[PDB]
């Protein structure tokens, strides 16, 4: 029940009706084979840094080819990896013991 008078309701709202996804034009896949299937890996002290640019990071191709015992992401969510675009991405490779 409302008594007589004038009341401030919520601000006028517009519900979005369409989605607009805009990504840059990329035609190639990221060098997953070059990074995760390299013939040789460096020592940990001489760890090797490589730059990645202009590619689609579809890690579903990593399935059925490689199996990771450790996979942990910091500052980001794993389930969010497919919906993002990454800037200044580098891959560091080395070998340690268990």
């Amino acid at each position: 029940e409302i008594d007589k008078g004038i009341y401030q309701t919520s601000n006028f709202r517009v519900a979005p009706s369409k989605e607009v996804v805009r990504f840059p034009n990329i035609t190639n896949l990221c060098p997953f084979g070059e990074v995760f299937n390299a013939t040789t890996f460096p020592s940990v002290y001489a760890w090797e840094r490589k730059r990645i640019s202009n590619c689609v990071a579809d890690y579903s191709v990593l399935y059925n080819s490689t199996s990771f015992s450790t996979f942990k992401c910091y500052g980001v969510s794993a389930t969010k990896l497919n919906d993002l675009c990454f800037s200044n991405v580098y891959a560091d490779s080395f070998v340690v013991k268990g």
Partner: protein
Amino acid sequence: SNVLHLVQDHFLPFDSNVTRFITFGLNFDNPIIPFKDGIYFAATEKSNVIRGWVFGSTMNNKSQSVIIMNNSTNLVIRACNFELCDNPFFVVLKSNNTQIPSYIFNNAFNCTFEYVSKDFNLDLGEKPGNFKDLREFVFRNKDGFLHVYSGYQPISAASGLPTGFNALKPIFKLPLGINITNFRTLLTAFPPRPDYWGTSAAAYFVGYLKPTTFMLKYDENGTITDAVDCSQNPLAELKCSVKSF
């Protein structure tokens, strides 16, 4: 745009002491200047005497070093294990105004980084008058990256570092991952006679960055046109507190 932005980073404090190294006559300044946290580099020159720098820790082949020299044709960034010459220079004949090969290092091995710029033409000729160009650089080494900020200003000062304000834009973020504690400038030489050396008038200035609070002002076009050093004086710390000039 149209905002006052307060930011804390490694900045060159206002009215800081800046050491000067000159190349004119009988002195060819090539010392080993410590890098510390970071350096502000400004070169006053009418001719392209300044060519680049060499950053490292021991400045020999016992550790990795990076060279950002600009030869006559293109800019070369090379992070390698360099047997650096104690007196590295370029050589250009004063009358011929041509560059001939010169040695910065004896041997390079175990190299980790390499970058070559696009080809361009550089004027090696000696020029008369006062200093015509001012090139400003900021070098920051943090988290395995060498940050380079560059800015250019036309000046007409005969001596000293001209006063003013200039915002340096980011040009390079080099993934070197090397320990940098020292650096040496690379200048070209103008030898008139073989077996003897010569110099052309040019100067560069070195200042050390410190962690400070700055209030940057953005104009309509998004450029930085002025700044306030909130640690300079009690008046300046008042302006930053109230966020107004």
